[PDB]
Amino acid sequence: ENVDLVIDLQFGSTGKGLIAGYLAEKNGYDTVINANMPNAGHTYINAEGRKWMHKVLPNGIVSPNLKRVMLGAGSVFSINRLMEEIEMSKDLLHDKVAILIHPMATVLDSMAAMVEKLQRDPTNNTIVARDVAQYDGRIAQYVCTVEEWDMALMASERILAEGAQGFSLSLNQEFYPYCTSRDCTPARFLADMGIPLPMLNKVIGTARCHPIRGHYPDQEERVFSFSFIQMQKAMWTCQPDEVFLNFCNYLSPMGWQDIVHQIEVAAQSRYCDAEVKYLGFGPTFNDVELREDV
Ligand SMILES: Nc1ncnc2c1ncn2[C@@H]1O[C@H](COP(=O)(O)OP(=O)(O)OP(=O)(O)O)[C@@H](O)[C@H]1O
Known part of the structure; x- marks a missing residue:
């Protein structure tokens, strides 16, 4: 049980x-892994002010004991974007860090590429990273075999897995067809990263006091008020062990402290022991605080 899995409990x-960056600095995982499809990017800002805006690489590459970065089979990515992101962190991706691209990850020329991979037509060798790697040397250094993928997980000591979009955007939650093309749940993220279920140690669920994006019945006003019902649904399926509540710096103390209580009452209502353990008051490492301290 050595995988910490970071997920999003609302609309993303x-x-x-x-x-993810904070945890990677604090815990020093040697392996970071994800399986993202094209997105608007995930941002981490460290204590000294450096900014990482990632659409392909995990934000966990800032771990001080990084050894492996792993892009799972569910990845859909642009090669141009990936090489740009690798170069901007080449100081972190030195000779001591191995980057592994799952052979069945999809290369973009998002949904049309996901369809062509599912088509499994034997003479289209332009789709999956294994086939693109034969004529595109930029990723040839990176794509591994399925056997190598499994050995890398076996060899990892502690793994930070970063999930994709947020629970309520799941393909099979209530808002279909106004949803993404995958379920956004721990089971599906682990599946899309090829992580065996017994490796899971804990799930860290994230939320904001005023979630961004129909919607849930108990929320209004895109920015919405906090939804207790949305959090109940997310707790039942995602069963986080710890919660990070972010953008508390947009509310009065009474404001975000009430949501802490509501999150924990929703958790308990859906047989989940989650604790609100982290609070976020800014976009920086230095703005993440421990709930027991504030
Ligand atoms: N507490 C905060 N205060 C102000 N700005 C913040 C705060 N936290 C994050 N931000 C900013 O919001 C943006 C974050 O990107 P986003 O939240 O979509 O990442 P994500 O949740 O990781 O992405 P995704 O939806 O793909 O899961 C960044 O520009 C970051 O600087």
Whole structure:
């Protein structure tokens, strides 16, 4: 049980990148892994002010004991974007860090590419990273075999896995068809990263006091008020062990302290022991505080 999995409990865009960077600095994982499809990017800003805006690489690459960065089979990514992000952190991606691209990850020329991979037509060798790697040497250094992927996980000591969009955007939650093309749940993220279920140690769920994006019945006003019902649904399916509540700096103390209580009452209502353990008051490492301290 050595995988910490970071997920988003609402409609996304909760600052999951911030807690991923924070956790990577605090815990020093040697392996960071994700399986993202094209997105608007995940941002982490460290103590000294450096900014990482990532659409492909995990934000966890800031771990001081980084050894492996792993892009899972569910990844859909642009090669241009990936090489740009690698170069901007080449000081972190030195000779001591191995980057592994799952052979069945999808290369973009998002949904049309996901369809062509599912088509499994034997003479289209332009789709999956294994096939693109034969004529595109930029990723040839990076794509591994399925066997190598499994050995990398076996060899990892502690793993930070970063999830994708947020629970309520799941393909099979209530808002279909106004949703993404995948379920956004721990089971599906682990599946899309090829992580065996017994490796899961804890799930860190993220939320913001006023969630961004129909919607849930108990929320109004895109920015919405906090939804207790949305949090109940997310707790039942996602069962986080710890919660990071972000953008508390947009509310009065009474404001975000009430939401802490509501999150924990929703958790308990859906047989989840989650604790609100982290609070976010800004976009920086230095703005993440421990709930027991504030
Ligand atoms: N507490 C905060 N105060 C102010 N700005 C913040 C705060 N937290 C994050 N931000 C800013 O919000 C943006 C974060 O990107 P986003 O939240 O969509 O990441 P994510 O949740 O990791 O992404 P995704 O939706 O893909 O899961 C950044 O520009 C960051 O600087």
